[PDB]
Enzyme design. Structure first.
Site, PDB file in Angstrom:
ATOM      1  N   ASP A  19      -3.937  -3.690   6.684  1.00 45.17           N
ATOM      2  CA  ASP A  19      -4.109  -3.295   8.079  1.00 45.17           C
ATOM      3  C   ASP A  19      -5.556  -3.333   8.564  1.00 45.17           C
ATOM      4  OD1 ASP A  19      -4.980  -1.224   6.541  1.00 45.17           O
ATOM      5  OD2 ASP A  19      -4.044   0.365   7.735  1.00 45.17           O
ATOM      6  N   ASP A  23      -8.380  -6.682   4.794  1.00 46.10           N
ATOM      7  CA  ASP A  23      -7.108  -7.177   4.286  1.00 46.10           C
ATOM      8  C   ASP A  23      -6.724  -8.538   4.847  1.00 46.10           C
ATOM      9  OD1 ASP A  23      -6.524  -4.929   2.655  1.00 46.10           O
ATOM     10  OD2 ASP A  23      -5.880  -3.817   4.439  1.00 46.10           O
ATOM     11  N   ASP A  34       0.837  -1.189   0.000  1.00 44.40           N
ATOM     12  CA  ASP A  34       0.000   0.000   0.000  1.00 44.40           C
ATOM     13  C   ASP A  34       0.878   1.247   0.000  1.00 44.40           C
ATOM     14  OD1 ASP A  34      -2.422  -1.547   0.205  1.00 44.40           O
ATOM     15  OD2 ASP A  34      -2.003  -1.793   2.346  1.00 44.40           O
TER      16      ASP A  34
END
Ligand SMILES: C/C=C(/C)C(=O)O[C@H]1C(C)=C2[C@H]([C@@H]1OC(=O)CCCCCCC)[C@@](C)(OC(C)=O)C[C@H](OC(=O)CCCc1ccc(/N=N/c3ccccc3)cc1)[C@@]1(O)[C@H]2OC(=O)[C@@]1(C)O
Ligand code: NA
Length: 981
Positions: free
Chosen positions: A693, A697, A347
């Site tokens: 997080d 996910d 990310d």
């Protein structure tokens, strides 16, 4: 009811047949409970100690040692109380290894168990049996229940909102999306049945918390049918494959039992002549014990008993070394997979970038005159949230008050803003309060100071929100139309303290298309083509060019609709309320990449590791950020290497797999795309690392070989990951991969070291049986060498200096064998040497020794017939064939050879002349201790009786060095061959 978000509030009540005012009757509750079950995730079926010790004794090498221990126990029973030491020691090894395994499983954490922490114990429902609300256990809630939630409550099930009893309703859906701002909820249906959870504005998800308000709702789904329960099913279905080294232990044990059984057949085939031996004899029970004792020694000589202690010690020390570099590895076997990383999907916000926004550029309209247009572009200094900075134009300091367009620009930024700034004296730094992108606006208006307010002598705490408060005094913010992704903008309705006006901000494309006029200072001009073309032109240069800025279009509705003509409950009408606007200007803020990230990307391409960026930005800015940090070149084609969420879904399943083979950037991805990307990477046998997080996910983190969580991430995201970044930095990933490569290079060296010793030990036991000699090595002695004598230099090999080109080589193939090719031939010659040098040292004492008898070769091979005192055997005490000294010659040869073989293991092919032994100081110190421990079992009286040893002299030791030291010269020639031929 899965599609409750797309159904009307009346449609949901009609589906279950429940009245909003009465609730579910006692019959409906017990009838819905038998159909949908209870509102709870399934309890994780833990394994018992009995099942855990069975799994411990399931390994084939463990079963071989356990069988050898059983043989040793019955041999010790039928024979000196030191005999039962051999069975007891073997059992202690297996038992201790079991305790280690039991401790590991107990300390292990399960993410499915972690999901329970988002389950409230109690819930509040309205049922037909009582008029008032009932606080029942959330387990007993069924679909169709009328539920009431308020501030502080945790949502017990997936709830379709019926009516909001308060002014607004804000929910903390952070458990799904990391750490997020509260989201406003409504009651009108969402037309798309395939809409994602961010867009289900009429839904309360189980596990989230009510930030503010109070609402009434009907339960749509419970148990595993909720959004958090569907994620549990995806994680429960994911299977974690064994690490490549764990798989290599399986094939090693499977091939080892096939060789042991073959050695036993070979020994019997060589001694088939005993079938022609006379039937009458007393050595038959002896011959069985002889072959049973050899079977025990054959197993002990083959199993590297000290390897599990050395491996777990190396991994435990590397974990402490990675934790110093902010890499928290949770599973020890993950360190190997860490060094085999082939693809890293990361990310952006938080990891690749600092997530600290600051407005860098802004432009307003200067002049509109037919086809002629003029803009007033500006620049801002200061990258922090602190109000320190100045506005510039053409690199010239300016006063923002002198520009009228900037006065209206700052009022939109201050009023259309739910965030604020705070000063923390403990840290001495201004801190953000709310969204990072909104706080960048609060910092911008403090630097502009359009009203020329005096803030030089103000306190730092007061300085934070000084200029913002001035603008707030002018206009009274009535209500707020919150942001929604369908229109990608928000607005605020304000009245003076001059008519009412609306201040709009949002994505540039949607806001500019809804602008019919253009602000020029204090006047306004109709929006034309040439102006709209130049406005969008500067948006493209700031978002796609080397600036890589996130742009916000700021507008104003000079003639807003009347208050009574607006419905503040339907988010569908909010876009209509934000039409016929007047363009004011555009601000451009930067989320800067971290300092160390651009260098870490270069390390990855030098190490053959592909980096895939995952953003929420548009495709144009995502490709621009990639070029900025080094994922793409400045002038590199990327037509088929960057995809969006919609572009990826419109592809067939075959093209999606081919897309993941070359893509390095994914912008605005759907929640299911992380897990699909992992599967496509695994289809090409990649070893994938994925960041995340949130509970969203968690399925992908478990699916990927190395799930990576954030130190600030959710607890479920951590418990579903192999490594947690303490500083959330992307550089921590690359630093942990470098360490996992360095650990494996040392790891395979002391694996080849201990395994080669087990080869020579088996050749020693095989030569004893094939020739009929007395036992030159005892299982008790072999255990001490494998656990202590060779274990200390093996640990020291784990501290070998790593190669300086270790990040200049592609990632290691997972199926690369540890010993093969020419190295397979080397450890055969070393094994053939150790086997012959050990049995020969004992035969030297039994024949050519000055202090030993001159036993002939026939007598030594037929030593089991001295009992008759045959005249064939010259008169001698038969007990000499059970003397302790010949076993000390064989053991001291094995010990000294393994100390020499440890130096040959410092490098695979480089000679010891080029790479001297003093490169590893820990290895020299380990050899001294292992040798110092060899004299301990030879002289301190209790031990020589146990190990069947008697101390050597200054002359007998020189014979050990005569046979042991040529090991270095042998392997050196084998290294010279591989280097030059
Ligand atoms: C053990 C003792 C003996 C005597 C034996 O019979 O050994 C054979 C044997 C089983 C072998 C063969 C051996 O054959 C021979 O000696 C042929 C006969 C020679 C004598 C002829 C006399 C006339 C080898 C010895 O021959 C030589 C020369 O080195 C190479 C290779 O071994 C390895 O690579 C070691 C992996 C250990 C290994 C084991 C576990 C492991 N675990 N990680 C973890 C990581 C993290 C956490 C936990 C665990 C990692 C690595 C193998 O071929 C092996 O079997 C295989 O399948 C290979 C590919 O492993
Ligand atoms: Na995983």
């Amino acid at each position: 009811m899965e599609a409750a978000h797309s159904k009307s509030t009346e449609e949901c009540l009609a589906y279950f047949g429940v009245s909003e005012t009465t609730g579910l009757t006692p019959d409906q509750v017990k009838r819905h409970l038998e159909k949908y079950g209870h509102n709870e995730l399934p309890a994780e079926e833990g394994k018992s100690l009995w099942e855990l010790v069975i799994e411990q004794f399931e390994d084939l090498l463990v079963r071989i040692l356990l069988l050898a221990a059983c043989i040793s126990f019955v041999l010790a029973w039928f024979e000196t109380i030191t005999a039962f030491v051999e069975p007891f020691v073997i059992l202690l090894i297996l038992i201790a290894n079991a305790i280690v395994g039991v401790w590991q499983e107990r300390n292990a954490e399960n993410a499915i168990e972690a999901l329970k922490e988002y389950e409230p114990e109690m819930g509040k429902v309205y049922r037909a049996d009582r008029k008032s609300v009932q606080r029942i256990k959330a387990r007993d809630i069924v679909p169709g229940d009328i539920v009431e939630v308020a501030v502080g409550d945790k949502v017990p099930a997936d709830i379709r909102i019926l009516s909001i009893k308060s002014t607004t309703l804000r929910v903390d859906q952070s458990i799904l999306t990391g750490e997020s701002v509260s989201v406003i909820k409504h009651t009108e249906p969402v037309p798309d049945p395939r809409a994602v959870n961010q867009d289900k504005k009429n839904m309360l998800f189980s596990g989230t918390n009510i930030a503010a308000g109070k609402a009434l709702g009907i339960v749509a789904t419970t148990g595993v049918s909720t959004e958090i329960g569907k994620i549990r099913d995806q994680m429960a279905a994911t299977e974690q494959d064994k690490t490549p080294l764990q798989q290599k232990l399986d094939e090693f044990g499977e091939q080892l039992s096939k060789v042991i059984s073959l050695i036993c057949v070979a020994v019997w085939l060589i001694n088939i002549g005993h079938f022609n031996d006379p039937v009458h004899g007393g050595s038959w029970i002896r011959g069985a014990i002889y072959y049973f004792k050899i079977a025990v020694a054959l197993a002990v000589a083959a199993i590297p008993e000290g390897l599990p202690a050395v491996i777990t010690t190396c991994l435990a020390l590397g974990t402490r070394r990675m934790a110093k570099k902010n890499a928290i590895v949770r599973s020890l076997p993950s360190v190997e997979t860490l060094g085999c990383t082939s693809v890293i999907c990361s990310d952006k916000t938080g990891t690749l970038t600092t997530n600290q926004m600051s407005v860098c550029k802004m432009f307003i309209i200067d002049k509109v005159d037919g086809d002629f247009c003029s803009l007033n572009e500006f620049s801002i200094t200061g990258s922090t949230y602190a109000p320190e900075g100045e506005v510039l134009k053409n690199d010239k300091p300016i006063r923002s008050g002198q520009f009228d367009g900037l006065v209206e620009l700052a009022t939109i930024c201050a009023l259309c803003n739910d965030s604020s700034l705070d000063f923390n004296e403990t840290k001495g730094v201004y801190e953000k309060v709310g969204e990072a992108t909104e706080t960048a606006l609060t910092t911008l208006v403090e630097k502009m100071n359009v009203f020329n307010t005096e803030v030089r002598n103000l306190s730092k705490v007061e300085r934070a929100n000084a200029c913002n408060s001035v603008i707030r005094q002018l206009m009274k913010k009535e209500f707020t139309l919150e942001f929604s992704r369908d229109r990608k903008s928000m607005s605020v309705y304000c009245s003076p303290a001059v008519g009412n006006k609306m201040f709009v901000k949002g994505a540039p494309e949607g806001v500019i298309d809804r602008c019919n006029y253009v602000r020029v200072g204090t006047t306004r001009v109709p929006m034309t083509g040439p102006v709209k073309e130049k406005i969008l032109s500067v948006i493209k240069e700031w978002g796609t060019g080397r600036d890589t800025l996130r742009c916000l279009a700021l507008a104003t509705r000079d003639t807003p609709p009347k208050r009574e003509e607006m419905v503040l409950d339907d988010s569908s009408r909010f876009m209509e309320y934000e039409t016929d606007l007047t363009f004011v200007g555009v601000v451009g803020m930067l989320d800067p990449p971290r300092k160390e990230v651009m260098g870490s990307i270069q390390l990855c391409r030098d190490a053959g590791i592909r980096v895939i960026m995952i953003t929420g930005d548009n495709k144009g800015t995502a490709i621009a950020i990639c070029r900025r940090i080094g994922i793409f070149g400045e002038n590199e084609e990327v037509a088929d290497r960057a995809y969006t969420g919609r572009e990826f879904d419109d592809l067939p399943l075959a093209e999606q797999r081919e897309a993941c083979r070359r893509a390095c950037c994914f912008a605005r991805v759907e929640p299911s795309h992380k897990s699909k990307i992992v599967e496509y990477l695994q289809s090409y046998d990649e070893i994938t690392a994925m960041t995340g997080d949130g509970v969203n996910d968690a399925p992908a983190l478990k699916k990927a070989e190395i799930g990576i969580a954030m130190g600030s991430g959710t607890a479920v995201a951590k418990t579903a990951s192999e490594m947690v970044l303490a500083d959330d930095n992307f550089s921590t990933i690359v630093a942990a991969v470098e360490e996992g490569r360095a650990i494996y290079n040392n790891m395979k060296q002391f694996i080849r070291y201990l395994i080669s010793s087990n080869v020579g030990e088996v050749v020693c036991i095989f030569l004893t049986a094939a020739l009929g000699l007395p036992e030159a090595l005892i299982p008790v002695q072999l255990l001490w060498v494998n656990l202590v004598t060779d274990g200390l230099p093996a640990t020291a090999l784990g501290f070998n200096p790593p190669d300086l080109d270790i990040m200049d080589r592609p990632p290691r193939s997972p199926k690369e064998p540890l010993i093969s090719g020419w190295l397979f031939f080397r450890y055969m010659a070393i094994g053939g040497y150790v086997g012959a040098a050990t049995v020969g040292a004992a035969a030297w004492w039994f024949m050519y020794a000055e202090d030993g008898p001159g036993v002939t070769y026939h007598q030594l091979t037929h030593f089991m017939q001295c009992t008759e005192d045959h005249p064939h055997f010259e008169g001698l005490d038969c007990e000499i064939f059970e003397a302790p000294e010949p076993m000390t010659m064989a053991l001291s040869v094995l010990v000294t050879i393994e100390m020499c073989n440890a130096l040959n293991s410092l490098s695979e092919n480089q000679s010891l002349m080029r790479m001297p032994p003093w490169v590893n100081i820990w290895l020299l110190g380990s050899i001294c201790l292992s040798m110092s421990l060899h004299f301990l079992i030879l002289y301190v009286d209790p031990l020589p009786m146990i190990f069947k040893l008697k101390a050597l002299d200054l002359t007998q030791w020189l014979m050990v060095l005569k046979i042991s030291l040529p090991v270095i010269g042998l392997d050196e020639i084998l290294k010279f061959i591989a280097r030059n031929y």
